[PDB]
Design a protein around this motif. Structure first.
Motif, short mmCIF file in Angstrom:
data_model
loop_
_atom_site.label_atom_id
_atom_site.label_comp_id
_atom_site.label_asym_id
_atom_site.label_seq_id
_atom_site.Cartn_x
_atom_site.Cartn_y
_atom_site.Cartn_z
N UNK F 125 0.87 -1.20 0.00
CA UNK F 125 0.00 0.00 0.00
C UNK F 125 0.90 1.24 0.00
N UNK F 126 1.97 1.22 0.79
CA UNK F 126 2.89 2.38 0.90
C UNK F 126 3.62 2.63 -0.42
N UNK F 127 4.04 1.57 -1.11
CA UNK F 127 4.87 1.76 -2.33
C UNK F 127 4.00 1.83 -3.58
N UNK F 128 3.17 0.82 -3.81
CA UNK F 128 2.36 0.76 -5.06
C UNK F 128 0.89 0.57 -4.70
N UNK F 129 0.14 1.57 -4.14
CA UNK F 129 -1.23 1.27 -3.73
C UNK F 129 -2.11 0.90 -4.92
N UNK F 130 -1.83 1.48 -6.09
CA UNK F 130 -2.73 1.24 -7.24
C UNK F 130 -2.35 -0.09 -7.87
N UNK F 131 -1.10 -0.54 -7.70
CA UNK F 131 -0.80 -1.89 -8.20
C UNK F 131 0.07 -1.88 -9.43
N UNK F 132 0.93 -0.86 -9.55
CA UNK F 132 1.81 -0.73 -10.74
C UNK F 132 2.95 -1.74 -10.61
N UNK F 133 3.36 -2.36 -11.72
CA UNK F 133 4.44 -3.39 -11.68
C UNK F 133 4.09 -4.48 -10.66
N UNK F 134 2.82 -4.89 -10.61
CA UNK F 134 2.37 -5.92 -9.63
C UNK F 134 1.38 -6.86 -10.32
N UNK F 135 1.48 -8.17 -10.07
CA UNK F 135 0.55 -9.16 -10.68
C UNK F 135 -0.26 -9.82 -9.56
N UNK F 136 -1.60 -9.78 -9.65
CA UNK F 136 -2.47 -10.41 -8.62
C UNK F 136 -2.57 -11.90 -8.92
N UNK F 137 -1.86 -12.74 -8.16
CA UNK F 137 -1.83 -14.19 -8.45
C UNK F 137 -2.70 -14.94 -7.45
N UNK F 138 -3.17 -16.13 -7.83
CA UNK F 138 -4.08 -16.92 -6.96
C UNK F 138 -3.68 -18.39 -6.99
N UNK F 139 -3.87 -19.10 -5.88
CA UNK F 139 -3.59 -20.55 -5.86
C UNK F 139 -4.74 -21.32 -6.47
N UNK F 140 -4.62 -22.64 -6.55
CA UNK F 140 -5.67 -23.43 -7.22
C UNK F 140 -6.81 -23.68 -6.23
N UNK F 141 -7.98 -23.08 -6.45
CA UNK F 141 -9.10 -23.20 -5.48
C UNK F 141 -9.56 -24.65 -5.39
N UNK F 142 -9.74 -25.33 -6.52
CA UNK F 142 -10.26 -26.71 -6.51
C UNK F 142 -9.11 -27.70 -6.35
N UNK F 143 -8.34 -27.58 -5.27
CA UNK F 143 -7.24 -28.53 -4.99
C UNK F 143 -7.60 -29.23 -3.68
N UNK F 144 -8.63 -28.73 -3.00
CA UNK F 144 -9.04 -29.28 -1.69
C UNK F 144 -9.60 -30.69 -1.87
#
Lengths: 37, 52, 309, 148, 59, 178
Positions: F125-144
């Motif tokens: 939030x302090x450095x890139x609040x808007x999300x520049x040079x950042x990738x929103x990654x997610x784990x595999x939901x249906x692995x349970x």
RNA sequence: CCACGCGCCGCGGCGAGCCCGAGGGAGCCCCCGCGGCGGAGCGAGCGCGAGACGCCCCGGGCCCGCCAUGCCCCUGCGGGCG
């Protein structure tokens, strides 16, 4: 600046309206006359 | 009442009349095996190929 | 790195001790309250009614044709063996097979006592908990108290480090509680006051009969003492030895690393006012004007807005 | 807690969530998983395939320790190597003094080849090896050895 | 017009005169801005949502 | 009476606030929401909803998956809304800048040894609040394991394992054994 | 109502790990503390035994076991490659 744009836009709509109200009124009157003729 | 079909069409159309979902139209179930083998052989070449 | 001050029995600063890592741990009221609730249930003593209660008498239903309810009746015809029957068993008798104790993971229990220790070092939490700490000169309070064996000696040390008003809040608070609790060997309720933690010093005899003062050793810091009522914030009078050994007790946990510190609400607010976020912020489009409906033809000023001519 | 339970929110409602037409009654469908081939046949078919019948050979007494077969994939063999030793072993490559792992000491009797192994030659000792285990280990330059 | 005949029992319909249109637009007219019922009391609201269609004013 | 039961199809339930008792998670959700209100960056619209997700919805992402995901983009800061975990299977972790809700101790040491920086949501939030040079990654939901058993086993097209041991012939050994 | 077992959901701790087991420790809420469960599956068994993609989700492709089948060949109703 937004208030200045709002004042400018308001005048343009008022101007369009003072002209259209008169243009359209002729169209309605002409339609009655044209069918009659 | 031995049998009634009343209300059945109100229940069906309450949240129903649902489409069969995608991936059912393009399913390979019941397609000729010889065609499916040809598809896999053709796909495994150049841009379509997904092996290393 | 901040160093806490150590006061003498006289109440003057004598020496300084570096701050232990436990105080830096994030303050988690939710964890301290979960661990507090399960641990206090573990102390519960099992209660139940007698198995033979309400089934000792011989009662069989009279049956139909007698113009009476069908509930089991004694030889007299007196209703029996039913929840609604006077002299009858409970519908679901209280049973000792209840699980009185709950279970907590060691990490979660250790997390709660670490967070409670951190809350003790926060001055605001201690005052909020109701301790009188305005006189106390530093939080945490560390005192080089030698082996105190006399209550009068202990009172003098506590007067000189400002804890006296808390000791008097608890002495003047002793009252007979309300309810049947009195009859159950719980007649008197007093307020909770300072907690003495000690290592290698005989300070127990001096402070034991002081009212509201509770004592603990640094090796077995108890959560219920640290967070009375599930509320963290205990005024803790540390002895110089106890505070010095706190970082040694935490090493003794064979494989425990204190939870890593996190931001506070104040820190989040400061970031939300920082230049980087303000630069990203974009101004919103001006809102719409709703303006309640009026008849246009009612007045010429009203008509003018819709029809200028 | 009893105070936060839904049952304490059904006071004043009479049936208590069980229905006016058919109220809670003692064991209406029977006790336990009865009626499996008769009235509850629909549930057993829709959710329990293979509940009814006999499937295969019966061992009157199974020796659990005799049938204990712990296994390790080729990907995790290097993790058994401690981190301080692991980095040095990997950097130096080395065939004169290659790292030697006895998976049996770590508790595994058979090696398998699920993942990939780093290029460093490594000698692996086990009581059995898969076909892929041997191939991937040999390609890396490691030797698959049997252990007494 | 084919759909309207199916629902004839529930409705009444006719060709409207310009004065009838003006009275409905002025006295009873309310916009649908953001799925809200916003009263049309000025030529500004009409301009805001209908300038693309050139419907700047009430006329 | 108004007929509101025709082209209108009920309301949907979307968690607008995190059910987490943790004070930290609430502090970040409110902060990321404040940024989203002032600047409607879609990176922040997702992050605000990724902090409101449940533990099951927020799956773990290992340093092995993150290496594969960031193979072409080392400079970009991975942003994971869950726990980053170590993969002992991957002998060498590449330098990567990862921001998460928690990093496992084994993972945290490995990323730092690689030279990568383990950030935190407050730091992001302090450095890139808007999300520049950042990738929103997610784990595999249906692995349970729970997800694998969802469905009606014993239906011809179900292709799902039964919940219990069962150990019997009827219904299992093929379509005919039913 | 409580106990116990099962299913699912939420939350807390930790993470390819996890765990107040029984117990032991001058020791009460403290410390220490195995199985187990997960991390590999499939096949009646003999046994054999997963990498190729992939923000996620789904679908496809491929790999593992079981079931065939064709070649090749070592240490051979054995191994490999389809």
């Amino acid at each position: 600046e937004r208030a200045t744009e709002k004042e400018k836009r308001a005048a343009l709509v008022k101007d369009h309206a003072v002209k259209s109200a008169q243009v359209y009124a002729r169209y309605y009157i002409d339609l009655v006359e044209s069918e009659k003729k | 009442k031995n049998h009634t079909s009343k209300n059945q069409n109100r229940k069906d159309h309450r949240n129903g009349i649902k489409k069969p979902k995608k991936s059912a139209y393009t399913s390979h179930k019941g397609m000729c095996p010889k065609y499916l083998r040809n598809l896999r052989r053709s796909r495994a070449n150049d841009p379509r190929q997904s092996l290393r | 790195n901040p160093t806490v001050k150590v006061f003498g029995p006289t109440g003057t600063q004598v020496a300084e001790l570096p701050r232990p890592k436990v105080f830096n741990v994030p303050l988690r009221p939710d964890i301290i309250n979960f661990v507090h609730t399960q641990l206090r249930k573990c102390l519960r003593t099992p209660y139940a009614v007698s198995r033979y209660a309400g089934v000792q008498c011989t009662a069989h239903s009279w049956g139909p044709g007698r113009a009476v309810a069908r509930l089991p009746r004694k030889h007299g015809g007196i209703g029996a063996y039913a929840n609604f029957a006077r002299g009858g068993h409970m519908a679901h008798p209280t049973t000792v097979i209840r699980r009185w104790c709950r279970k907590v993971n060691l990490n979660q229990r250790r997390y709660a006592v670490a967070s409670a220790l951190a809350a003790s070092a926060n001055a605001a939490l201690v005052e909020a908990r109701g301790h009188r700490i305005a006189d106390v000169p530093s939080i945490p309070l560390v005192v080089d108290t030698d082996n105190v064996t006399k209550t009068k000696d202990a009172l003098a040390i506590i007067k000189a480090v400002g804890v006296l008003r808390d000791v008097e809040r608890c002495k003047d608070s002793r009252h007979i509680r309300a309810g049947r609790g009195k009859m159950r060997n719980r007649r008197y309720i007093t307020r909770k006051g300072p907690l003495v933690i000690y290592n290698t010093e005989d300070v127990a005899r001096g402070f034991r009969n002081l009212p509201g003062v509770d004592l603990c050793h640094v090796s077995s810091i108890r959560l219920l003492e640290l967070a009375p009522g599930s509320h963290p914030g205990r005024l803790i009078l540390w002895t110089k030895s106890a505070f010095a050994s706190l970082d040694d007790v935490y090493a003794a946990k064979q494989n425990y690393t204190l939870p890593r510190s996190c931001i506070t609400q104040t820190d989040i607010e400061r970031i939300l006012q920082s230049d980087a976020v303000q630069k990203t912020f974009v101004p919103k489009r001006d809102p719409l004007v709703i303006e309640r409906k009026v008849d246009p033809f009612s007045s010429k000023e009203a008509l003018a807005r819709l029809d200028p001519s | 807690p009893t105070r936060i339970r839904k049952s304490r929110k059904r006071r004043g409602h009479r049936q208590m969530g069980y229905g006016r037409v058919g109220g809670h009654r003692k064991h209406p469908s029977g006790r336990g998983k009865a009626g499996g081939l008769q009235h509850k046949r629909t549930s057993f078919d829709k959710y329990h395939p293979g509940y009814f019948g006999k499937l295969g050979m019966r061992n009157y007494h199974v020796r659990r320790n005799i049938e204990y077969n712990p296994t390790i994939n080729i990907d995790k063999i290097w993790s058994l190597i401690p981190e301080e030793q692991r980095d040095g072993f990997l950097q130096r490559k080395s065939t004169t003094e290659a790292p030697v792992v006895d998976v049996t000491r770590f508790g595994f009797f058979k090696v398998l080849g699920r993942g990939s192994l780093p290029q460093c030659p490594i000698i692996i000792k086990a009581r059995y090896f898969s076909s892929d285990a041997e191939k991937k280990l040999r390609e890396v330059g490691g030797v698959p050895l049997l252990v007494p | 017009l084919n759909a309207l005949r199916i629902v004839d029992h529930y409705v009444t319909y006719g060709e409207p005169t310009v004065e009838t249109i003006r009275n409905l637009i002025y006295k009873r007219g309310f916009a649908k801005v953001n799925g809200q019922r916003i009263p049309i009391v000025d030529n500004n609201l009409i301009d805001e949502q209908l300038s693309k269609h050139n419907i700047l004013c009430a006329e | 009476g108004i007929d509101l039961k025709t082209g209108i199809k009920k309301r949907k339930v979307e968690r607008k606030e995190p059910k987490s008792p943790n004070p930290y998670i609430r502090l970040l959700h409110n902060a990321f929401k404040v940024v989203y209100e002032n600047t409607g960056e879609d990176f922040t619209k997702v992050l605000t909803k990724r902090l409101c997700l449940s533990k099951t919805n927020r799956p773990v992402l290992s340093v092995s998956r993150l290496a594969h995901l960031m193979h072409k983009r080392e400079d970009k800061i991975a942003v994971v809304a869950s726990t980053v975990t170590n993969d002992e299977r991957l002998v060498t972790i590449p330098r990567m800048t990862i921001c998460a809700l928690k990093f496992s101790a084994t993972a945290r040491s490995r990323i730092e040894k690689a030279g990568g920086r383990c950030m935190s949501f407050d730091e992001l939030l302090a450095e890139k609040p808007t999300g520049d040079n950042c990738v929103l990654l997610q784990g595999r939901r249906s692995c349970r394991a729970v997800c694998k058993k969802f469905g009606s086993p014993g239906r011809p097209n179900s292709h799902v394992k039964p919940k219990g041991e069962h150990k019997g012939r009827r219904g299992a050994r093929g379509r005919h054994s039913w």
